Design a protein around this ligand. Structure first.
Ligand SMILES: */C=C/C1=C(C)C(=O)N/C1=C\C1=NC(=C\c2[nH]c(/C=C3\NC(=O)C(C=C)=C3C)c(C)c2CCC(=O)O)/C(CCC(=O)O)=C1C
Length: 296
């Protein structure tokens, strides 16, 4: 590889959310994505006390600052700005740098009450790894609506194989394609064992830089390992561009503490899935991983 890009130190986010970093000691926003004020209908954000941004959010955050019961990551409802808009705030604490709050607009979410059960039932009947992975791609297509869904499985040599695939009729089948191990470097795989869902809304996005770049608390790049809005490697973006893919969802399949493979979805237009469905997807994938795990 390809093992040297520090993808967790991206210094920037995708533009469909905003990112705030709050000091644990004084609760001011000490670092933010450059779009944050525009995104949140605020005049300014940098240097502003969280009490000014939204008092109710500060109240929600305070108990999480107890080192004996941090209770993060956590997803909280809040209303920010004037005019006021509802957001889901996804908050976590990196080892150093302060408290990170990533905000997505609340919006319509996909409804799974009539369609999730038949797909889950099918998974439950799978008696082989073939059946299980085929059923996995149908389940995730049915829950998410992506144009193409794959199980990307690492073989015994670490090569990537598109082991199962479904897609809307007329699109290219990547089923059976095999790729070098370095197309997903070990450093990336290691991150994906911890950060189990990634959503790339538009491959062509203009990265939104953090302001300032370096954390004021450390003088170093912000650790963005746990940020759902993190900008992704330009090499990977280029890969997807050269395929003509416009958007992706990927969910880790973790077996034995290692990345066994991924559920990888492609869309040919921009696409976002909101917090709850990301969580559902993460969980489904863990359940499927338990079954793999049992199947060999
Ligand atoms: C030499 C390094 C690389 C080459 C060559 C390359 O093609 N990519 C290289 C590095 C990275 N890959 C990263 C992530 C990544 N790559 C893939 C590969 C595929 N996705 C597909 O859909 C297909 C084919 C159908 C392939 C072969 C995947 C699935 C991922 C993870 C994507 C995700 O989680 O969304 C990567 C890190 C990206 C990042 O997280 O920032 C690098 C540096």
């Amino acid at each position: 590889n390809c093992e040297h890009e520090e993808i967790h130190l991206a210094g920037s986010i995708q533009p469909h959310g905003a990112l705030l970093v709050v000091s644990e000691h004084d609760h001011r926003v000490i670092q933010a994505s450059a779009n944050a004020a525009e995104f949140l209908n605020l005049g300014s954000v940098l240097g502003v006390p969280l009490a000014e941004i939204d008092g109710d959010l500060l109240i929600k955050i305070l108990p999480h600052l107890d080192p004996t019961a941090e209770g993060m990551p956590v997803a909280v409802r809040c209303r920010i700005g004037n005019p006021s808009t509802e957001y889901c705030g996804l908050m976590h604490r990196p080892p150093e740098g302060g408290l990170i709050i990533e905000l997505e607009r609340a919006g319509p979410s996909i409804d799974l009450s009539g369609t999730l059960a038949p797909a889950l039932e099918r998974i439950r009947t799978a008696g082989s790894l073939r059946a299980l992975c085929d059923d996995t791609v149908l389940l995730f297509q049915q829950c998410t609506g992506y144009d193409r869904v794959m199980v990307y499985r690492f073989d015994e040599q670490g090569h990537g194989l598109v082991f199962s695939e479904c897609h809307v009729p007329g699109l290219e089948s990547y089923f059976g394609n095999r790729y070098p191990s370095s197309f997903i470097p070990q450093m990336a795989r290691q991150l994906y064992v911890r950060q189990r869902v990634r959503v790339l809304v538009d491959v062509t996005y203009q990265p939104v830089p953090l302001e300032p770049r370096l954390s004021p608390l450390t003088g170093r790049d912000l650790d963005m390992s746990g940020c759902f809005l993190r900008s992704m490697s330009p090499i990977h973006l280029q890969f997807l561009k050269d395929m003509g893919v416009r958007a992706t969802l990927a969910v880790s399949l973790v077996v034995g503490g290692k990345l066994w493979g991924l559920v990888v979805c492609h869309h040919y237009l921009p696409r976002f899935i909101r917090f709850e469905l990301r969580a559902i997807c993460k969980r489904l994938a863990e359940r499927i991983a338990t079954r793999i795990t049992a199947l060999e």
